[PDB]
Structure formats: C-alpha cells, structure tokens
A paper describes a structure:
Prc (also named Tsp) is a member of the family of C-terminal processing proteases (CTPs) which features an embedded regulatory PDZ domain inserted into a serine protease domain. In Escherichia coli, Prc is involved in degrading abnormal proteins that are unfolded or partially folded and marked cotranslationally at the C terminus by an SsrA tag and that are exported to the periplasm through the Sec translocon. By associating with its adaptor protein, NlpI, Prc is also involved in the regulated proteolysis of MepS, a lipid-anchored hydrolase specific for PG cross-links. The activity of Prc strictly requires the PDZ domain, and the PDZ deletion completely abolishes the protease activity.
We also crystallized Prc-S452I/L252Y bound to NlpI in the space group of P212121, which differs from that of Prc-S452I/L252Y alone (P3221) but which is the same as that of the substrate-bound NlpI–Prc-K477A crystals trapped in the activated state. The crystal contacts of these P212121 forms involve the NlpI dimer and the NHD and CHD of Prc only; hence, they provide further information about the structural difference between the two conformational states. The structure of Prc-S452I/L252Y in the NlpI-bound complex shows a similar resting-state conformation, with the root mean square deviation (RMSD) being 0.62 by comparison to the structure of Prc-S452I/L252Y alone. Interestingly, unlike the liganded Prc, the NlpI-complexed Prc-S452I/L252Y shows a flexible helix h9 with a poor electron density map, and the coiled region connecting to the PDZ domain is partially disordered. Moreover, the docked PDZ domain in these resting structures has higher B-factor values than the protease domain, which is in sharp contrast to the findings for the liganded activated structure showing a relatively rigid PDZ domain, helix h9, and the substrate-sensing hinge. For the sNlpI–Prc-S452I/L252Y complex, protein was crystallized with a solution containing 0.1 M imidazole (pH 8.0), 0.2 M calcium acetate, and 11% PEG 8000. The structures of Prc-S452I/L252Y, sNlpI–Prc-L245A/L340G, and sNlpI–Prc-ΔPDZ were solved by molecular replacement with the Phaser program, using the structure of sNlpI–Prc-S452I/L252Y as the search model.
Numbering used by the authors:
A (entry chain D): 27 to 243, 246 to 323, 325 to 671
B (entry chain A): 31 to 287
C (entry chain B): 30 to 287
D (entry chain C): 26 to 243, 246 to 672
The structure:
C-alpha cells in the first residue's frame, strides 16, 4: 500500500434501518431521559471525532470545520438513517492516518537524540486541533521519538528500534485497509451510545468465528473494552486465573501477548477481536501478558495458566485471626454466586463454635453478582426489612426484602471494601451501614449503581422482506438504578466507609465518578425499616485507636509516603520527559525503592534479603496490612460493645 | 346517568361461532388464515377477551410476520401490561411496515405518556392531531400529554384546537368542560341529548367518565377519579382506548394502595 | 357509592377456552366425552356472558346425548331470560324427570313461574328448594319475593322465621335483615365493604345486593332508583349469578313499558 | 258373542303414567286460565269424568258414585303423580253396568209398545239425581227404550222393523263396548281434566297406521267434528267447503246416519268419532249423504246429500255485487273467511264500487269462523286512517296491540257490517273495531263470542326412545294461550259484538255461541288503547231503528220469523221434555210440515211460481231467500240519506 489504494468504504443497505432502530430504543427506552435535539447532536459529533482521532494528531482544524457546519443536524440524520457524514469522515482520516504512518516511516531514517529538555503530553484529548501540515509533523516528530525512547528504555539497539517501529507503522497501514463498513457503522453508533452514558453500546453481529469455537471447543477470566488503541480489562470473573494472580487490576491496558517459549508480539493499536483471540485457546496451556497499568510506561509481565472457573475457588473462604486471647472470623467473599447465603450460614455456625468476638465480611475487589444473593446475605444480619430499592426506565420503584425475622449472627460485624467493590457488594455494605448493623472499613466503592440489558435489532419480518439475511446487532442500554433503603443512590458515591484506609482519602483513577458522562447521583423517598442498632457513638474512639496503630506501622508508613509523593507530582501526571538520562534514572530509582521496600519487609520476617529485584519469585504474595488493621478495628468494636 | 352495561350482541356471537368452523377447515390459504385470525382477534378484543385476542394475533404473525395491524394491537396490550419498552418496539414495527398506519402514532403517543415521557408523547399526538384536526379526542389526548410539560400552554393549545375546528363531533363537549366553558351537569345534559339508544349512551359514558376521571385525578380527588374510572369500565365498550386507560388508571391506584 | 372494578375475564378462563377449542377440533373425544366437554364450554361461555355461544354448545351436547339434565337446566334459564316462560317450564320439568335430585331446577323453575305471574306454584318450587338447604339466605330471599305477591304480611313473618331458625353465617343474611327492617341500606352497604376481602368478592356482593335493593325500590314504585340499582348490579359483570340475569330481565321489563 | 262379563278388564299402558304428569305440567303452569288444582278443582274434575262415563245418569247407581267419591278431592294429587287407577276402576265398572242396561233393554224389546199415555221423556238428565236401586235403573230404561221405539215409529216403521233395528243397535252397543283400548280410557280421563279448565282445552291421542294410510291415499266435506257425549257433532265448517255451500248444515248439528254413493242410511249413534268420519271420507265426485239432528228440539231429522272435493280457491274468495233500490245503489262484499290475500282482493273491488257511484257499502260476515288475525287488522284499516285494531293478552300477562299504520282510507263513505251468531274471532275483531271507531253501523245478531286462541303442544320429549323404545309416539295437549280485547278494553269473550240494529233472531236467547259452552272463560275488561274515533253514528240510531221496525212490520218473511220466536219463547220452560203419545207427536210432525209448506207456498205466490201440493216435491237444491240482506240494503241507504244531510 503506497497511495490511496485503500477501498473507499460504503454503508451496506441494512445500516439505513439499523440506525433508525437504535434511535428508537435509546430515545424512548433508555433510563436517562435526554432530548436528541441540536445541543445533543453537537456532543455526539465531538465524540465521533475523538473516536476517529483520539490523540488530536491525524485530522486538521480545517477538516473538522468542513463537516462541523452541520454538527447540530446529526440528531435528524440518525433518526432518518442518513449516515454519509460518518462515512465521509472515516474515509477522510483513513487518508489522513496513511499520511501520518507514511511520514512516521520517513522520520525512522532521521537520527534519534535523547539529550534535550523536551516533554511529551500523553493527554492530547482537549487539545486545540492541528492548524497545518507542520504541526501535524511536529506532533509525529514527538510521537515517533516517544515510541523510540519506550523501546530504548527496555534495552533495544538502534537496529531493533527501527525495524520494530517499521513493523508497527506498516501493520498500522495494513490494518487501516482491512476495516469494513461494519467497523465504521459500529463506531458511529458508539458516538451515539457513549454520549448517553458510558455503559450504553451498539454490538455488531458475530461471524462464523464464534460459531467455529463453540462448534469444536477458553482464555483467562476477564472481559475487555477499548480505550482508544488500547485493550482495557473491563472486569474479572470471581476466582478466575486473572483474579487469582493479584497483579492484574480493573482498568489495566495490554501492549503485547507472548506464548510459552515464543517471542513477545506487540499489540499496539489493534482491533479487540484479534487481540482477544491471541489470549484465548484450549485447556491446560499457558499465555504470558505484557501489560501497562492505569495512568508513563512500565515493562510489567504477568504469566497465567488457562482454566474453567473452579467452584471451591469462587466459594466463600473462612479463617480465624487470633490476637493474643481474642479471635475474629473472616469471610472472604470473592463474588455473589447463587448459593453464597447457604455457604455463609454453614461457616457462621463454625464461627460460633470457635467463640469469636467479632466477624469481618471481606468484599475487596468483588465485581458484584446475583442481586438476589446481596439481599439474602444482607438479611442474615438483620431480622427483616428492605435491603435495596430498584427504579426502572418507566418511573416504577420495586423494594427487595429479607422477610424471615431471623438473625444468624447478632454479634459485632465489620464489612471491608475497596474501590473495586461493585453493585452487589455496595448493596450489602450500604444496607449494613443504614441499618446501623456494621462498621464499614476501607475505601469508597466503585459507584456503578445501574444495570444494563441487551436487545436484538432483528425483527421477525426482516428475513421475509430482505436479501440482507445477515443477522443484525444488538444494543446494550441502562434500564434500572439502585437506591439505598435511606433513599440515596449508589451511583457515583457508592458506600463511604465509617473508617477510610489511607488510599481511600484520595482522588482515585478508577470508579464510576470518573467515567465519561456517568449518570448523576440522586435521591428518592426512604423505605420503611427498623434500624438494628447505632455505631456512631463509637466512631471517634475507633478512629483514634486506628490512627495510633497505623502511625507506628511500616506498611502503612510506606503506603502514606507514596501518597504524599503521588499527589505532589500530580501536576505533570501526563507530561513525560524525552531525555534518556532523566528517564533511565527515574526507572533505576523506582527499582531501588521497590527492592528496599521488599528488603525492609524481609528483615522484619527473618527472610533472606534480595540483591536484584529480578530474583523475586514470580508468585510472590504482597502482605495484607488492610486486613490485619481491620482485625484490630473489629476487636476495638467487640471491646467497645462492653 | 347510567347505561345498561353492553352485552355481547347476537351478530358478534354468530360471527365468532362461524369463525371457529372456518378456522377448523383446511380450505384456507396462509394469507386468508392470517386475515381471519386478525379479524377474530379484533372480535375477541371487541368483547374484552384480550388473552384470546393476543393468542389469535400471535398465530397471525407466526404465519405472516409483516402485518402492521397485528403489531398495533400487540403494543396496545404491552401498554396495558405496563411493558412500555416492548410496546414502543411494536408500534415502531407498525410504522416501519406502513408509515400511513396513523393510529400507531395515537397508541405509541399514549404508551409514551403512561411511560413518563411526555415530550416524545407530544411529538406523536401532535402528528396524530395534524392528520385529522376535527377529531376532538386528538385534542383531548394531546392536551393530557402537554399538561405534564406546562398546564398553561396545554390549555391555550387545547382552546386554539376547539376554536379552529368545525365543532360538530360530540366529543368537543368534553373539550368545553376541560376549558371551563360548560359544567359537568351541562356536559351530562348534552350526553343524554346526543345519545339515541343504550349503545350510543354507553359509548358516551365510557368516553366521558374516563376524561372526567382524569380531571378529578389532577385535583388529587382519588375517590371521585376511582368512581369515575369504574363507571367508565362498567359500560363494557371494551375496545375504546378510554376503557383500556380507565382500567390502567384503576390499576395504578390499586398498586399505590 | 360502593363500586367494584367491573370483573374482566381471568387468564385461566381464556386459556381454558382456547384449549377447549383445540380439543373439540380433534378426534380425542368419545361421543360421551364430546357431550361433557360441550357442556363444560357452555358453562364457561355462560360465565363470560356469551349466552348464544353457550346455547349453541348446549344444543350440540343434546344432539349427541339427549338425556343430559344439566343442559336442560341452562336451556330453561335462557328461555326464562327471553320471556318464554312456557318453554322454560317444559325444559326444567325435563330436568327433574331425568334426575329428580337436580335441586337448582326447583330454583330456576320457581324463578321462571315467578316472572311468569304464577306465584302460588313458584312458592311450591322455592319452598322445596329452601327445604334442601335452609341456611342459604338466597333461598329465603327468592321464596320471600314470590310469597309477597300472595300475602305481603305472611311473607315477612316466614322470612323472619327462616332468619331466626338459621345459623346466620352466610353474608347474604344481611340482605334478609334489610328486607326485615333490622338494618338500614347504609348499614347493609357498610357490612358489604367489611366482608369483601378483594375486588372479586366485592363485585359478587354488589351484583347480589343491588338486585335485591332494586326489587325493594320497585315494590315502592320508585322506577328511577330501581333502574339505577339494576344497572349497577349488572355493571359488576358477574354474568351467571341469577341476580345478574334477573337484574337484566327487570331492566328489560322497565324498557318494555316505555 | 258377549252374554255376561267377557269384556276384558282394561288397564293403563306403561307410557300413561308419564303422560298424565306431562299433561298436568302444561295445564297447571302454561294455561291462560290461572286455576288451583287443589281440593275443590279435583272434585269438579271427578264429576265431569262421571258425566263422560254416563252422560244420561242411567248406567251408574248412587251407591257406585259414592264408593269412589269419598276420595274425589284427592284426584289433583293423583293426576300429578300419574296414578290412573280410579279412572280405570270407574271405566271398568261403568263398562259392566252399561252391559247390564243393554241386555235389560233387549229384554224390554219383547214387551208391548203403548203410545197412548199422558207421559213424557226429559232428554236433559245431566243435573238429575243418581238412580238409588235397580228399580230406578229399569224405570229409566223402560223410558229409554220407549223413546227409541217412538223415534223409529214416527219415521213410518212397523212393530217388526222397530224391534230388529233396536236389536242391532243394542247388540252393537254391547259389541262396541269390548273394542275400546286403554287409549280410550286415558283419552276420556284427560278430557275430564282438559274440559273442566275451559271447553277449547283437549288431550289428543296419537294418530295410528290408519291416519298414515289416509295421507298415503290423500274428501272431508269441509267440516271439523267435535263430540258432545253420545253424539257426532259438526264443530266448525271450512269457508267455501261443500258442507258450507249447501246451507242446510249449521254449526252444532248432530249426525245420526250416513249414506253411500247409492245406498241406505246406516245409524252412527253412540259411535267413536274416527269410525264415523271414515264413512264420510270418500273419493272426489262420488257423493255421501248424512242425516242431521239439529240443536235443541224433539228429534225431527233432516237428510242432506253432499258431494266431496278439495277447497276450490275462488269459492273461498270475496264476492262483490250491487243492489239497486229504484235509483240508489249499495255495494255488498260477501267475505266467507279471512284468507291470506283478502285485503288486496277487497281493495280491487272497492275501486270497482267507486266506478258504479254507490251511496253505501255492506261487508257481509254472516257465518265466517275467522281466519288470519293479520287480515282482520289490514281489512279493518281500509276504513280508518290509522290506529290500534285489537289488543292481545297472553298466559304470562303480556298485552300486544296489532295496528293499521298507513294513515290512508280506501273507502271513507257509509259502511254497514252484517254479522250473525256464526261470525267468530277475525269477523268479531273487524266488526268490534268498525263500531268502536264510530266508522260503521253493525247489523244482524250478536256474534259467537270465541275471544280466545289455542295451540297444540307435543308431549314427546327428545330423550323418549333413547330411554324407553317400548313406547310409541305420544299425544298432544291443546290449551288456551291468548285472549282478544277491543280497543275499548272490552273482551270479545262470551258477548262478542252487539249489533247497533239487532235483526229479530238476535235478541232472543240463542242455542249456539261461546256464552252457552260448558265452563267458558268469563268476560273481563282491560285499559282502553289510545285511538282517534273516525266518526259517531249514535246520532242516527233512533231514526234508522224506527224506519227498520216500520218495514219489517209489513214484511211476510220477517213476520213469519217473528211468529216462530213468539212460538219458541212461549214453549221455553218445557223445551227438552218430549211427549211419548204417538197421536200428540204425529200431530206436531204433521203441523210443522203443514206450516213449512204454507210458508213456501205463500213465498211462491208472491214470486209468481207454481204452488207445491206436498212438502216432499221441493227440489233438494231449493235456495231459501235472504230477507236479512234485502233489509240491510235499506238500512245502508237510510244511513247514506241521514249522513249526506
Ligand atoms: Ca433475616
Ligand atoms: Ca288505513
């Protein structure tokens, strides 16, 4: 491919109908009540550009203006199914991209000079659009230099760096000519979908490729989305191999997929389906994943054995922490699987045999599960009452209740949560707080307080009236919003713990409250419930004993000085230096710190000290000071209840 | 003012017994069978046998899935069940198969209204109003939706529709009550005057008591509204939109208890 | 002021009807099974006020099997509603010839003789019907209504005796207590609301009560109160209560005087 | 060859139990008459069963009625439960007591006949006390056989002929008595029930193989025959039948002899009806001759010869004619019956009457037994603009008005309606409406007064013959469902229409008419209909009535007919009582003949016609004149004269 030998893409005949069909469902059935007026079309227009050119370095300001005269008119066009503005902008910038990758291949002949005072901003999302071919070459001067230093900082020769980036910019050229009309339609609908809320989506029909996997035959336990050009881990399945190796976290981005023995294949700016196909393959086997965390670059590798979810793994696990005389039961609930409430009841009877003084329910990094199990589990600790109010895309509020007037553990209760405790875990924790049944410890929760469903765009008369038999897609849109028994929504706030562990008293990267166009937080009328108790009396003495212990604790001391560091250097979180000596030093010093943190840990534990950070066993388990401190909080509560 | 609640007529019961004999034969093309399953569904619906109607309507679709008429009734029934989402899909299916099927704007409008989406209900009911402006019930249904947006401009628009029109159709008398021009008693006096027999009486009562029921519902008088919805439904003119929405309203008062 | 939501066909009634069509269209039925199932659908059509459809099934049942008392009973009920008292008498007599223990044929023949202007003979049937279950308040009511055309005072004495003899558990004795003078129309209606547990029990109470109230006002010559009360009885759509069918007959008689 | 009790003792068939129950349902519930089958009513039923078994009170003994009359009040319950045995035990008893009389009667035929006394015979023994002992029973059949003997003597028979005729008659009376079925006992049992309610109510036995054969050959001389015990009676006549044409036959006439194509008169006295009717029903063209004992007089019997045929349509049709009187003219419509299409024929003829410039019209409805109620109303409506014509009440209380609704008058000039004692149902409705509207003068006699209608109902049920195939077809009942009332609110029952000018035979109490039938429903009123009277002729009545009396004073026809009324009313207290002296009876016979011949010969001298020397030389087809019509024409002209003033 040397010129415009790239096919100019056409709308298929079906796409007319499908646009009308999705405008019916979002404009009428969506939980969020928006007007597809002039203001809303504008915002749709903007987000389509940001899907075409995420980094504001392909299109010219004079190319956005050529179509932005009719930005307010894009509502009417989606209703009527006039798709040409979408196809004319994706055929443009299919051109403009080839221009950039052509230019980029040219700049790989020029010499690389990492000795300057210069900078690279990774957030160009609200950038002014490029004026001329010069600034388009200044931004791709910057871009190819960053790509060159990233590979240098992982110890690569001038030779290796030039042939890797050649292969990247020419497969980027070849990828650009493999896209079909379903890819440009898919992105057009996404601009519509994502302007309503971030959980709304259009989803293209599956090809035989899904047919043939099911016909004849299994990856790691993760579900993936697209940050532009980046494959993001959306969520992880409870007790999956992904979830077991606690290195992988929600919102993290892959840059390469290696197999056993064979080389690391770089997956920079790919279509998801091909990236995910590299990871997926039958039982027993292994796959290694080089990935980079959420918010410069870090050369992190994870290695995982492929599996089917094992029931005992996703099962609740119980154990007793002892502190001299006193004991504390701990229920690790990885997920809200059908049958959880029954397994919990079994383990609670074991906990009453061992004369514990208090119990911790651990719901850190629990992606929700059966709303039904959240309610039954809530109900084990209260006599009876409402647990959650549900409001639908119609005005209707439903109350879900526990109605046996029974308490299977009436003793002191702590719920441990973090920023990855989702839907179910939030409902349980919120109910235990509102009823005055339990102290809530850890970080503010995720805040995804809404539910989505899928709907086929197929209609029963399609095959009878059409040649175009290709199954059509689905939409995915928000139908329901959870509210607490106190009438507060879990949206965007989730549950604030009664004692916030130091990472939670910070702005986070992850959580619904930072998602693009997340629905607001709002209230309704409180349900009718009898509070089982009140722990607000105890809060100040529990909070004072907590601060006293974490001040004399090396783990919490270490985690607090990284927070004093992470918030101080927040100014430049997106601005990266292009000087090899500055970047190598900051890489060397991270490793020196990490090694000295591990070696300070091992000196306490009587474990021999590491001389290289590379000698650390790949299965190393980080300790849990959040759990060990929550046990003390749980015992303070058992004491304070006299 | 009460009618004898309507009873099935001898013609309805003859036709139904005939439709059974004919559907039980193998004399019918697929198209004739689907038309006659639709005709019987309309008749079952005309007697308030909605589950039997839905059963015939679904059989018709199975055979011939490109029937807008059937899609219309299916959405009406998803509205009555409170499945507004499903209903909007059904009416959109009507208008895709036939964009001239006007009553799908009426019924989608009404469904959006009960569905808590009056701006969009006004789009459909304004359109339906435009297609026949002298139909007083189009000014009534539009008004009810517009009242949720702004009660003042709703009453101005209503009043404009009345003054524009030739004012011949009986239902303008219900508009005149909504506007202030006449009393509940004058409305009922004209209702008796214009009714020529028990059937015309019952139809006027099913219509009028429903709109009276909505008036009282807006002042917060739940007992007068409940009575008036009940008395509309007691005329057994099943198949009037007013009868179906009388029953839905009673349902909403019930599910509040 | 006490109103029910007028009854709507239940989902079970509509499912069973659609199922009875599929079975009657099949060859899964013996002549005897076919006749039984045509009778059962007639009862169901009648439950929904589809009397011409019902009559059609009842007549097909007889065509197959002419010795069915159940069917003769519904045929006479329908001749009563049409005002053909003569034919109706013949049908119920046919019932009791085929089965002398078919008790409700005394009820329905009694009612038909009553509307037929033959109170002495209506008292013979309704007295008999009363003897077969004396704690059924509606037997004391129907007997009373016939006996008041013969002798207004002995009727009230007999009614009063039936009430004092009974265990007075069944709701309908409250309508008797109103007929007697023991309670007001307002107390009757207050007890009506108290005893109704749901919309269906409400509707049934109203269909029953408003018909007996209708008869009370009709005996004082109040045609407007009668007419309203009959209409409001019939507006509960409890098709297949004798009170619904005789409410409709009374409205028919008020029509035919115009 | 019956010489003692070889008469088989009859018993109920299995069906009869049910049929009694079935019949008791319909009469007690469906009948227009609202009676209690209580104590009082069973008694009256019992009495009428005895009177059906022994009409003449000369077969049973007061000791035999008393044996069963202890439980007479109980016979209501027995008919309900279908316990028939009291009917069969009385019919088996009376059958033997009847055998006793006919053998004793054969004994008295040997004794001498003596017609020379001062003695009499009462022919009505219906409210007579029952015979005490065998001495009353032989005194009454001494008397019976003497009357039977004098009847045959007075028709010129010798001692010899008289003894052999009565021998056959008394031996066939015995032989007939042992042909009777259980169906004959049941038939009469139900008749006692039926006829106690009203005289038009009946039980009707199923038709056999024989009725099937008659239809197979499908003639009746145009008459319907009813039975008054021990007599075959002409109940009604069909319009334009051969019976109705030869005017020598009137309603209530008793048949005592039937003739053949060529042959002697065979006696049919004491017969069952089906067998009597079999003598008459013969091939068309080949005639049959019948004897006639008429209503209520010492038995002088007429013989009539009539041919058989089907009802020819133009004989049943309306017939029009013009009477002239010097200059003035009067149209006459002879309406024999109210056939479907009458009103259309009338309209045609009324337009012909317009052409001939007539000053009044007469509608003649003498001897018109009714017809289609619908035609009564349309025909009524031709002379009024519009209004109700007749109100009909049913068994259940419903009153319905039949109306003329075109506001049209197709004649509007002076109208007379001519009626007699044989004008029934439809004729009465028309005449009653013409009087009440003030539209027409009504002339002639008081009408029949049958103001009720009857229908037939099968006692068959659709499940007879799945449950009881042994059973044959069962009977019918015939019961009164409807009663006619005028627009004035008066019923036509028992009174019918009183004419404005009563022609002399009408004022005098009549033999025939509903008001003399046994247990006829009463006359009663209802609320008048709303109607606008088209006129008022009460003004004219006295002048019309005085000119009428002036003419009929000078008229030998009317003079003769008034002298027979002074004769029939003077010999009224002793009217059924008949003498047993041959000299007094032959004299009364001779003088009737002398009178009749002198009346005919006075008529012939007026007409210029040659005189008769013996009453037997009168041709059998002689046509009696119509002075009632000729006088009605003058009445009609008086009205046109009085009206045009
Ligand atoms: Ca509980
Ligand atoms: Ca006329």
């Amino acid at each position: 491919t040397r010129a415009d030998q790239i096919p100019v893409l056409k709308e298929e005949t079906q796409h007319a109908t499908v646009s009308e069909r999705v405008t019916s469902r979002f404009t009428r059935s969506h939980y969020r009540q928006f007007d597809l007026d002039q203001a809303f079309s504008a915002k749709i227009f903007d987000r389509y550009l940001n899907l075409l050119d995420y980094s504001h370095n392909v299109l010219l300001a004079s190319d956005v203006e050529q179509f932005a005269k009719k930005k307010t008119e894009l509502g009417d066009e989606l209703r009527s199914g006039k798709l040409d503005v979408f196809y004319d902008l994706y055929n443009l910038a299919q051109k403009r991209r080839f221009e950039r990758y052509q230019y980029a291949l040219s700049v790989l002949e020029k010499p690389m000079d990492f000795t300057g005072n210069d900078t690279y901003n990774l957030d160009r999302s609200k950038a002014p659009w490029p004026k001329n071919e010069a600034e388009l070459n200044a931004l791709w001067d910057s871009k190819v230099k960053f790509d060159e230093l990233s590979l240098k900082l992982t110890g690569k020769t001038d030779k290796e760096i030039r042939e890797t980036l050649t292969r990247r910019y020419k497969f980027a050229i070849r990828r650009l000519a493999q896209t079909n009309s379903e890819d440009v339609f898919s992105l057009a609908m996404t601009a519509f979908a994502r302007e309503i809320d971030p959980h709304t989506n259009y989803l293209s029909p599956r090809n035989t490729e899904q047919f043939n996997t099911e016909m004849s035959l299994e990856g790691i336990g993760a579900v993936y989305q697209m940050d532009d050009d980046y494959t993001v881990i959306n969520s992880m399945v409870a007790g999956g191999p992904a979830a077991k190796s606690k290195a992988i976290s929600v919102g993290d981005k892959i840059v390469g997929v290696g197999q056993t023995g064979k080389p690391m294949v770089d997956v920079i700016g790919w279509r998801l389906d091909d990236v995910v196909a590299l990871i997926k393959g039958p039982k027993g086997s292994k796959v290694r994943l080089e990935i980079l965390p959420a918010g410069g670059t870090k050369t992190r590798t994870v290695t995982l054995t492929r599996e089917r979810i094992r029931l005992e793994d996703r099962a609740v696990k119980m154990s007793v922490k002892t502190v001299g005389k006193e004991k504390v039961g701990v229920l690790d609930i990885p997920g809200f699987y059908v049958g959880l409430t029954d397994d919990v009841k079994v383990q609670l009877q074991k906990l009453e045999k061992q004369n514990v003084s208090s119990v911790i329910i651990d719901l850190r990094s629990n992606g929700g599960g059966a709303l039904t199990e959240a309610v039954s589990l809530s109900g084990l600790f209260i006599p009876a009452g409402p647990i959650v109010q549900v409001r639908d895309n119609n005005g209707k509020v439903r109350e879900d209740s526990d109605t046996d007037g029974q308490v299977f553990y009436k003793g002191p209760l702590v719920v441990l949560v973090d920023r990855f405790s989702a839907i179910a875990s939030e409902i349980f924790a919120a109910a235990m707080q509102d009823y005055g049944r339990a102290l809530v410890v850890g970080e503010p929760t995720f805040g995804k307080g809404t539910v989505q469903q899928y709907r086929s765009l197929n209609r029963i008369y399609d095959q009878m009236l059409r040649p175009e038999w290709p199954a059509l897609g689905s939409v995915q849109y928000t139908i329901q919003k959870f509210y607490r028994v106190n009438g507060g929504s879990t949206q965007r706030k989730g549950v604030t713990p009664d004692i916030i562990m130091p990472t939670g008293n910070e702005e986070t990267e992850t959580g619904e409250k930072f998602e693009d166009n997340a629905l607001p937080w709002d209230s309704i009328d409180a349900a009718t419930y009898v509070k089982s108790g009140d722990l607000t009396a105890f809060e100040p003495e529990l909070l004072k004993e907590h601060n006293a212990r974490i001040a004399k604790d090396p783990e919490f001391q270490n985690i607090m000085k990284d927070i004093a560091r992470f918030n101080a250097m927040k100014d430049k979180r997106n601005i990266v230096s292009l000087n090899y000596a500055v970047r190598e030093k900051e890489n060397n010093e991270d490793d020196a710190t990490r090694l000295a943190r591990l070696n300070e840990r091992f000196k306490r534990e009587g474990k021999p000290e590491l001389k290289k950070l590379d000698d650390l066993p790949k299965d190393y388990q980080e300790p849990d000071p959040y759990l060990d401190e929550t046990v003390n909080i749980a015992l303070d509560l058992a004491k304070l209840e006299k | 003012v009460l009618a004898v609640p309507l009873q099935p007529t001898l013609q309805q019961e003859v036709i139904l017994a005939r439709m059974e004999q004919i559907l039980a034969s193998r004399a019918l093309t697929d198209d004739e069978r689907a038309q006659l399953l639709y005709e019987r569904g309309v008749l079952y619906d005309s007697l308030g046998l909605r589950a039997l109607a839905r059963n015939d309507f679904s059989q018709a679709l199975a055979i011939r899935p490109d029937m807008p008429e059937v899609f219309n009734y299916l959405g009406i029934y998803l509205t009555q069940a409170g499945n507004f989402d499903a209903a909007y899909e059904a009416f959109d299916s009507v208008l895709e198969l036939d964009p001239t099927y006007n009553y799908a704007h009426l019924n989608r409008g009404i469904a959006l209204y009960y569905g808590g989406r009056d701006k969009l209900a006004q789009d459909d009911l304004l359109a339906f109003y435009q297609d026949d402006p002298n139909d007083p019930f189009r000014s009534l249904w539009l008004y009810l939706a517009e009242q949720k947006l702004d009660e003042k401009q709703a009453k101005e628009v209503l009043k404009q529709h009345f003054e524009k029109s030739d004012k011949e159709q009986w239902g303008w008398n219900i508009v005149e009550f909504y506007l202030g021009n006449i009393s509940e008693q004058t409305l009922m006096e004209r209702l008796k005057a214009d009714a020529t027999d028990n059937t015309s009486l019952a139809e006027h009562l099913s219509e009028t008591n429903f709109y009276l029921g909505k008036y009282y519902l807006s002042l917060g008088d739940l007992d007068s509204a409940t009575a008036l919805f009940k008395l509309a439904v007691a005329n057994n003119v099943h198949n009037f939109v007013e009868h179906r929405y009388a029953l839905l309203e009673l349902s909403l008062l019930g599910q509040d208890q």
